């Protein structure tokens, strides 16, 4: 029998409604294109930028209503989100591939499968290299039997980082860090006992997520410099902050 720590139950209760988010972003992009005439239609890159934008909107709404995070004053909330916004987007994408992804394609938040082949044919070297290490990370997580309880734990570990300067209530953040780490450790030890170091193996994925996240930020920033990013984009505001 599986055992799930009470804390992780609380974390799961704060999870977004995936079908609702999917339908919402799907409808948003379809309406966006509908409002544009033929020569105004967004390119693939433009669409994906607005898609990532809407995902980030959803992530901010998730955090705002979530346990522990809603306890902080807005100034601490901003600082935490300013630190980890791209990490959460990458983590969200990666886990989506672990669960909903077929190894030959990319599963988008809007629900479509985009073949990796299309990316290899239409994207430059930077994006392909970026996708390649995402693929490796997804493959690694699959081999570890990465599941939803561990995902929601890592999500909170990413959000409540202690590497954030100028934090007002840093010991609350430290408290969440310790509680979630402890719960994750107990969960892995109880439910995956033949993987004696699964906890450590999961933690080691965090610097890999952060490295991908930094490269992704840099890729997007330079795409913006060439004028390829569609106008106004919470992504871009997060970058310019």
């Amino acid at each position: 029998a599986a055992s799930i720590p009470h804390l992780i139950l609380e974390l799961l209760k704060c999870e977004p409604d995936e079908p609702q988010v999917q339908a919402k972003i799907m409808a948003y992009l379809q309406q966006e294109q509908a409002n544009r005439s033929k020569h105004e239609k967004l390119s693939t890159f433009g669409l994906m930028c607005k898609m990532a934008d809407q995902t980030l909107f959803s992530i901010v709404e998730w955090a705002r209503s979530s346990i522990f995070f809603r306890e902080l004053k807005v100034d601490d909330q901003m600082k935490l989100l300013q630190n980890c916004w791209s990490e959460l987007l990458i983590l969200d994408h990666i886990y989506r591939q672990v669960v909903h992804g077929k190894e030959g394609s990319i599963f988008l938040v809007t629900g479509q499968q985009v073949d990796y082949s299309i990316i290899a044919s239409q994207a430059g070297a930077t994006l392909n290299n970026l996708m390649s290490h995402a693929q490796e990370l997804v493959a690694k997580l699959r081999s570890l039997q990465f599941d939803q309880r561990e995902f929601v734990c890592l999500k909170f570990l990413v959000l409540f980082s202690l590497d954030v300067k100028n934090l007002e209530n840093f010991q609350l953040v430290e408290g969440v860090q310790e509680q979630v780490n402890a719960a994750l450790l107990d969960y892995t030890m109880c439910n995956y006992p033949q993987q004696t170091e699964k906890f450590g193996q999961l933690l080691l994925r965090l610097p890999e997520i952060r490295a991908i996240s930094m490269q992704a930020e840099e890729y997007l920033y330079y795409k913006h410099l060439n004028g390829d990013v569609p106008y106004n984009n919470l992504l871009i505001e997060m970058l310019h902050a």
Partner: peptide, 9 residues
Amino acid sequence: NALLRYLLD
């Protein structure tokens, strides 16, 4: 980041 601040409210 006035936009992020707004969204959190």
